[PDB]
């Protein structure tokens, strides 16, 4: 589940990066407009005053596009941190999942334990807790039955 | 003026490199809150002062670096408790055999 | 401990924010140099 969620997070991060690159392109276009107005004001409500005002306008629009690029960067970094945490958790679980499991044991576990959906991965530990409790209950119950049978045998 | 316009690229790149730390810190500061509140409401079930004393006089103190894994180290300590409560139950079994 | 985490992050966030603001100020200062040179050209 962690590896599948990691691939999903990679897709989300790719979407964020696709947005980020084109926002950078928009920023470049706005900087080109800024340079155009700067050179116009250097060349000349006169046309020079319009060049000044629209140079400031181009700088303001460039600032807005850079803020949008920063928002895209923040989304990309949030998803990147999510992916890094997912990889860390996946490797931590791999520390125990690497041990493998015999085919009979896998059959029994699959035929006795439920499964979780992709995004519901966090609740898998709720299943772990609940089934730990149930398994321990049954373990001690059978142990107590064995205890009374042993006492009767004595 | 050409040089001044050109040099802006390095500064913009460095600003982009810097933004990431602020993003990460905001993310962490927002994320810790849900765990904090859930833990607090779990604690709100309450303990009588005597119960608090009995629990604390044997259970370890925890710190920040163990906080991320506290949800598992806690279960390890619970395993430690139960692995001896089972021994106590076994001694009850042995003494019941002897008594019978 | 989560409250301690929250407080520590509250204390730490300001350093990264200050670094980001310093780089923003440097970018605006580069733009100021650009403006100084362009306005020098405006005179001639």
* Residue in B1, B15, B35 nearest the CB of C23: B15
C-beta of residue C26 within 8 angstroms of C-beta of residue B11: yes
DSSP annotation string for B22-56: HHHHHHHHHHHHHHHHHHHHHHTT---HHHHHHHH
Size of interface B-C (CB pairs under 8 A): 73
Question: Which of B5, B23, B81 best probes binding to A when mutated, by most A CB atoms within 10 angstroms?
Answer: B23
Q: How far is Cα C37 from Cα B4, in angstroms, rounded to an integer?
A: 8
Interface touch B20/A77, C-beta < 8 Å:
yes
- The per-type count for chain A, helices as H runs and strands as E runs, is 4, 0
C-beta of residue C28 within 8 angstroms of C-beta of residue B30: no
CB under 8 A, 24+ apart: contacts of A85-93: A86/A2, A86/A5, A86/A6, A86/A9, A87/A6, A89/A2, A90/A2, A90/A3, A90/A6, A93/A2
**Burial profile A44-78: b = 16 or more Cβ within 10 angstroms, e = fewer:** eeeeeeebbebbeebbebbeebbeebbebbbbbbb
Interface of C with B in 6-35 (CB under 8 A): 6, 8-10, 12-13, 16-17, 19-20, 23-24, 26-27, 30-31, 33-34
Shortest alpha-carbon distance between residue A103 and chain B (Å): 28
Phi first, then psi: what are they for A119, rounded to 5°? Answer: -75, -15
* Chain C interface includes A38 (CB < 8 A): yes
Q: Experimental method used, please? A: cryo-EM
Chain centre to alpha carbon of residue A126: 21
Interface touch A151/B19, C-beta < 8 Å:
no
* Chain A interface includes C38 (CB < 8 A): yes
Q: How far is Cα A27 from Cα A18, in angstroms, rounded to an integer?
A: 14
Q: How far is Cα C4 from Cα A1, in angstroms, rounded to an integer?
A: 32
Q: How far is Cα B15 from Cα C20, in angstroms, rounded to an integer?
A: 6
Nearest to C33 by CA among A66, B6, A36, A30: B6
* Residue in B7, B25, B32 nearest the CB of C16: B25
């Amino acid at each position: 589940l962690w590896r599948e969620k990691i691939n999903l997070l990679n897709a989300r991060l790719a979407e964020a990066q696709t947005s980020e690159e084109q926002l950078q392109s928009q920023l470049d276009l706005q900087k080109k407009v800024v340079s155009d107005h700067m050179q116009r004001y250097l060349q000349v409500d006169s046309d020079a005053s319009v060049a000044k005002a629209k140079l400031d306008e181009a700088q303001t629009i460039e600032s807005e596009l850079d803020k949008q690029l920063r928002a895209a960067n923040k989304v990309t970094c949030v998803l990147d941190t999510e992916l890094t945490l997912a990889r860390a958790a996946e490797r931590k679980a791999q520390q125990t999942a690497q041990q493998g499991m015999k085919e009979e044991e896998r059959e029994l576990s699959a035929s006795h334990f439920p499964v979780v959906t992709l995004e519901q991965l966090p609740d898998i530990r709720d299943l772990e807790r609940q089934h730990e409790r149930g398994i321990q209950h049954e373990i001690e119950r059978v142990k107590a039955e064995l205890h009374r049978l042993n006492i009767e045998l004595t």
